[PDB]
Amino acid sequence: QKHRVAPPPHVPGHLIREIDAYDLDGLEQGFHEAWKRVQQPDTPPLVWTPFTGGHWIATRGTLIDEIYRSPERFSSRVIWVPREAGEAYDMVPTKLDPPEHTPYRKAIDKGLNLAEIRKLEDQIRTIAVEIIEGFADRGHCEFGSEFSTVFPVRVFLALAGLPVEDATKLGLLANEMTRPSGNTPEEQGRSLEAANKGFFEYVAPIIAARRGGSGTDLITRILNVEIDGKPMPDDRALGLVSLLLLGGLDTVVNFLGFMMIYLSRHPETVAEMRREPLKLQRGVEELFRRFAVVSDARYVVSDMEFHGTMLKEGDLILLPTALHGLDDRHHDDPMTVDLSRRDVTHSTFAQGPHRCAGMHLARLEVTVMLQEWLARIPEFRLKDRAVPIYHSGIVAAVENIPLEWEPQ
Ligand code: HEM
């Protein structure tokens, strides 16, 4: 049974569309495909759905980009739907606007900046090779369970100085943050609340132990950056370290699954990467354009008209980032990966002050993964008649990716 809310007085009937971000129409065909169904040639730039507590959805890339770049008009005070979940959400600094946001972002950047991430290349490669070597000679693997859910998690837990055996419990918390269970706004709010609490419970002892610590791990490094000349307060630290874990353990895992399903179906594209290693390197951003996974929100700060649409203070707008990268008004033949595409502009990492702090790490993990994968398994396909299983929500997910190849 689908939970509906009535439209508020300012929402006109002609803008209503029945879109369920947590179970998109057509999702069985793919997450990206399902979002693209919403972006028809004449669909309005902003549409309102009665599902998920009632909210707007931006349907074109230019709006998504603008909204992310405009924190004074579209606040991060709520960035999740349903509203109840967004109000429960307590991660730092994603819940903050400038100026409060900026010293926390500075702190994160001390740990995640490009120069720091470059130092991690060898560690990341070692992890990728070890995993791949486990099945390269076999001729098959279930890529989800055997690689994409393993590689980025081992990388991040190592970087954060955390035990690899915590992967399961942290993954379960992540799932309930980005794809909270429930079929009512209130149920989903309770799910997210519980997940966010689990994260705080996990991180609290780590923070206490690493304040003033001598560890060289990511958490000690970021935790001990002063905020306005003083140690970071406990409340902020909980949200910050939890966010690092959430970002570190969910997004790349799911990105890789979508990417690999596509590559398994496009052997010509794989072959280009194999024949031209610089095309691979230079082509990774095209992959980010093509395989967006985040659909999150902003809070309308003031009554306004935006792209011909009347918005009220407190309205939530969902930003399905796939609808920037895959917008046919921005990219010709948007569903094809063209490694030589000159303009790859996208909002896969959002825009504005919150533009992903992990983007350098994400790019490196993907680059290294592809390099070490193709070195060892140069050709591969999706098992005949296999059907991946798709999930939509704040972060998309995919499972069941059985790959096959002739061992080299
Ligand atoms: C495929 C990979 C990734 C994608 C698509 C992605 C996407 C995003 C997006 C869209 C945002 C903006 C959220 C918002 O403000 O609405 C963001 C923020 C963030 N991401 Fe990522 N992310 C990825 C990987 C990572 C990794 C590996 C980390 C490592 C911890 C990370 C850490 C963060 C952090 C800390 C922020 C908050 C930045 C701020 O508020 O200033 N992300 N990410």
Ligand SMILES: CC1(C)[C@@H]2CC[C@@]1(C)C(=O)C2
């Ligand atoms: C939507 C996000 C990708 C962004 C960073 C991690 C994530 C799940 C958040 O909580 C904010």
Ligand SMILES: [C-]#N
């Ligand atoms: C970012 N996650």
